[PDB]
């Protein structure tokens, strides 16, 4: 079944791609050339076209995500040459310097050889090639709640934590063959953090605050015409509300709301004072202040709403059909001011696209 | 098949109903009088019994509803014995005296003689007992947009609004053999209106805005059993968000934010201000702090939610199922904030339950 499966698949995303790309007279015949070796190798192997095209689409067609309007101008980086863990980590950090670009993100995948017979050649442990590290101990909480297996993980296998709040991980990722990933340390000079002021209470930066200026999510698989890309890690630029109404803000993860509030001067002691509303906001505008201080890109949810509407209307002048996630468009912040919240979405899955995948630790 | 669905639907309600009331034994006997009555003159009644633990399910089954944890003390009001408009009207002036109860908001509902053939004895046009006109003509917007059909209709009808912001629709309602409804102003003494002010800002009342103390919706059908109850006004009191969020907040409402911005003081030019988000804090703050100084009951997105999951957690206690919509259930303020963000909910319809109905107009 397993070859029928990729046979089909091939077909259609062939015929979808190169119509896309004008090259529709030329699909009969590179579907024989397909169809022949996969016959014969059980697999077949993209042309650098139908790669770079194939993360464009996948990107175009993940319902979940808000800055879908720039698909087509997506970097893709060819790796699947590599064979050597070395040159992955090198492509690792190549990946982090070239989309950081000196805070001018540039959305940027780095595709590394893809499964053969479900068999990975390359598996990365990261969730984000730059994320902070976790620890809970007797009570003691320390950084990110959600690393706190990974870096469990990586204890295990020789590395050590300074037990900061803001430890960065090291990258960790598993060759086809090694029973057990290798670990290395970032270098601090590729990694961009931007510290949390606000711009009008001093008193802000009394919380110490700081977060990395480029989400680089590396546990997600790239599917495309049937080719199971399980290592191709991806970059955008933030959208405010992931860092401050979230990752900085949610109680299972850094709980900063009460301090916030502390800081800007208000109580926290009655619900109806809506303490909390009002430190998220001030959370968040001082999030959007302090990246834009330190030249890093990054959006506000407003913005990001005004452009995926135009990614609507863009997808309905082409005649493709949108597809949306409506619970996970809608900003955690005033949701109902933007146009998203008055409509509806259909949640239907379309390939090429990334998804989920099981985790090689816990 | 008519009466067959009428069947069906009474014996799973008679069932379920008698076996809450710990009347399961009945139950047989019950069924029998039913099935006899159905079949010699196509419906049947309701016992007082069976119609308020019915409307209280029902409310109990509303998906959207995040007040439901209050579902059993219900104020149930029987007045199938109506048959006249001013019977009518004086229920209607009654439902709204009883459920404002000064101020101390008593959760209630007034129910009138179903439809027997589909054909309705009582049909109330208003959305809300009590509710805002709105008009819309040569550019020139005046009160609540979501009233301008209705409005319109009353105003084919003999009636003519001041054209203020806040003109007070009449009641207006059809009796069953009329061609036309009728409509009757609502006596003002009848109606507590809630001034919004701000605790820390005292511009904010430079707006002039305010609302009503007590949201009573008008054109839901309760549906009991197979009966279908079309006329059956019901009302709580209001969740903050609903008015200074969306209310008052909406582009497509009244479409305050602009000059909430201005009376708080801060500049509405750039989204990464967030100037939308902080003027629906402020806004929403306002809401909660005027009707608790006017003695008018309230409750908060956080409080509620609170309930919610209590809830939640009673359902599974009591072994029974539990339905929501998620797109409905979190508030259109700091939604993450609160538990039902961060899970899921079945969106299943169970009956007893209130739906939707054409509207008259239009
Ligand atoms: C250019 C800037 C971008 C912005 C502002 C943006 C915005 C977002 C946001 C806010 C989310 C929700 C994340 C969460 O709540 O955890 C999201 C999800 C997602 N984005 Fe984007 N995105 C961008 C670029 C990209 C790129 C380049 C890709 C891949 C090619 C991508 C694919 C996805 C996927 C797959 C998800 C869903 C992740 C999941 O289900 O856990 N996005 N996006
Ligand atoms: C006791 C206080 C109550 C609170 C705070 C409350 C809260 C809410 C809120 C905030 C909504 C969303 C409304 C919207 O966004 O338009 C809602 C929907 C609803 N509530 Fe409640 N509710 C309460 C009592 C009741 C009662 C007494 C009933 C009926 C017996 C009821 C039945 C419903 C129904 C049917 C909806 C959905 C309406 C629709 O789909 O348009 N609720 N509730
Ligand atoms: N700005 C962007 C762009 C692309 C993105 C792709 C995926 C994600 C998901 C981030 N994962 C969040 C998360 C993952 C695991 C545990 C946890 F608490 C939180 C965010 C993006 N954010
Ligand atoms: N606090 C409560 C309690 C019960 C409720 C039941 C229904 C509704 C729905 C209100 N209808 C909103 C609406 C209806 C029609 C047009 C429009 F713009 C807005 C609100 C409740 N709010
Ligand atoms: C299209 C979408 O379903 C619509 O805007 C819904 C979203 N969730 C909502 N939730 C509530 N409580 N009230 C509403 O009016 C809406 N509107
Ligand atoms: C249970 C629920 O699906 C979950 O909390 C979702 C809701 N919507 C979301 N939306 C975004 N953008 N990100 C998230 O992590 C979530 N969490
Ligand atoms: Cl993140
Ligand atoms: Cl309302």
Same mark, same amino acid.
């Given at each position: ?20 790309? !004008? ?12 169809? =022949? ?10 042309? *650098?076209?139908?790669?770079?095209? !194939? ?19 997506l970097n893709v980086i060819d790796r699947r040459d590599v064979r050597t863990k070395e040159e992955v980590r090198d492509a690792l950090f190549h990946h982090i310097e070239t989309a950081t670009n000196n805070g001018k993100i540039r ?5 590394? #050889? ?8 390359? $598996? ?36 050590? !934590? ?13 060759? *086809?063959?090694? $029973? ?18 606000? #711009?009008?209470?001093?008193?802000? =930066? ?8 480029? #989400? ?9 015409? !049937? ?7 991806f970059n955008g630029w933030y959208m405010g509300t992931e860092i401050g109404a979230r990752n900085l803000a949610d109680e299972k993860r850094y709980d900063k709301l009460k301090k916030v509030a502390s800081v800007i001067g208000i ?33 506000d949810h407003h913005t990001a709403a005004s452009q995926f509407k135009r990614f609507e209307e863009q997808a309905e002048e082409a005649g493709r059909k949108l597809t949306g996630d409506w619970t996970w468009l809608i900003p955690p ?17 379309? *390939? ?11």
């Amino acid at each position: 079944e397993e070859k029928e499966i990729l046979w089909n698949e091939a077909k259609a995303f062939i015929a979808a791609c190169y119509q896309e790309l !004008g090259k529709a007279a030329e699909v009969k015949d590179r579907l024989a050339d397909i169809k =022949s070796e996969i016959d014969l190798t059980g697999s077949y192997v993209h042309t *650098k076209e139908e790669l770079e095209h !194939g993360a464009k689409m996948a990107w175009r067609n993940s319902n979940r995500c808000i800055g879908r309007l720039f698909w087509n101008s997506l970097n893709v980086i060819d790796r699947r040459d590599v064979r050597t863990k070395e040159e992955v980590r090198d492509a690792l950090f190549h990946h982090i310097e070239t989309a950081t670009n000196n805070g001018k993100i540039r959305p940027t995948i780095t595709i590394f #050889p893809p499964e053969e017979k479900g068999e990975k050649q390359v $598996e990365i442990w990261n969730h984000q090639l730059i994320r902070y590290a976790g620890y809970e101990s007797d009570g003691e909480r320390i950084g990110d709640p959600a690393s706190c297996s990974l870096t469990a993980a990586c204890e295990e296998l020789g590395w050590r !934590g300074e037990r900061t709040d803001f430890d960065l991980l090291p990258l960790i990722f598993r060759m *086809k063959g090694d $029973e057990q990933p290798v670990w290395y340390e970032l270098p601090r000079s590729l990694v961009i953090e931007v510290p949390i002021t606000h #711009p009008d209470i001093e008193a802000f =930066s009394d919380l110490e605050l700081k977060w990395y200026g480029v #989400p680089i999510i590396s546990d997600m698989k790239l599917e495309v015409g !049937g080719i199971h890309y399980n290592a191709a890690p991806f970059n955008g630029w933030y959208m405010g509300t992931e860092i401050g109404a979230r990752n900085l803000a949610d109680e299972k993860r850094y709980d900063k709301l009460k301090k916030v509030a502390s800081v800007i001067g208000i109580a926290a002691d009655y619900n109806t004072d809506l303490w909390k509303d009002q430190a998220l906001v001030e959370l968040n505008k001082a999030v959007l202040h302090s990246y834009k201080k330190q030249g890093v890109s990054i959006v506000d949810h407003h913005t990001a709403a005004s452009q995926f509407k135009r990614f609507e209307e863009q997808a309905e002048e082409a005649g493709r059909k949108l597809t949306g996630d409506w619970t996970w468009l809608i900003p955690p912040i005033s949701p109902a001011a933007t146009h998203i919240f008055h409509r509806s979405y259909d949640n239907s899955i379309v *390939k090429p696209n990334y998804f989920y995948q099981d985790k090689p630790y816990e």
